[model samples]
Target: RYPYYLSDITDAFSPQVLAAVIFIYFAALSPAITFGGLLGEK
Candidate 1:
């Protein structure tokens, strides 16, 4: 069977996908930013 790659691409633009993108962007970055700041202060 063929992959549904075209539908997957279309779904990427949906609101839930966008929201997860934004959330993960911050969720992944926030810890690094916080630790970097703490380390720099020492």
Candidate 2:
């Protein structure tokens, strides 16, 4: 994703993205891990 301009961000946040954030939060809150690029997952 490209950098969102200030105006773009000021307009609205997508529901899909919002839901994704929620899931990511819960995943991170739990014992789950995201062993991807940081740890070398392709």
Candidate 3:
């Protein structure tokens, strides 16, 4: 059972890849969210 927090998530990934991974995560999620709003549906 993991008690989650923001710090836990950050520590789970590699430090060297953190910035790139975060950038990619945002890039991927942003469009889906944008189109979701445009479609006005979940």
Q: Which candidate, 1 or 3, would have the higher TM-score against the true structure? A: 3
**Model 2: lowest-lDDT 10 consecutive positions:** 32-41
Error of 2 at 7 (Å): 12
Clashing residue pairs for model 1: none
Model 1's number of clashes is 0
Off by over 4 Å in 1: 1-12, 31-42
Taking the tens digit of each residue's C-alpha lDDT, what string does model 2 give over 1-42? 344466376546576787776688687844544433254456
Model 2 lDDT vs. the true structure? Answer: 0.60
lDDT agreement with native, every candidate: 0.67, 0.60, 0.66
Model 1 lDDT per residue over 1-42, tens place: 435577576865687787786688698965765554343555
State every prediction's TM-score relative to the real structure.
0.32, 0.35, 0.37
Q: Tens-digit lDDT track for model 3 on 1-42?
A: 344466686775678687886788698875765554344456
Residue 4, model 3: Cα distance from true site in angstroms: 5.3
Worst 10 residues of 1 by lDDT: 33-42
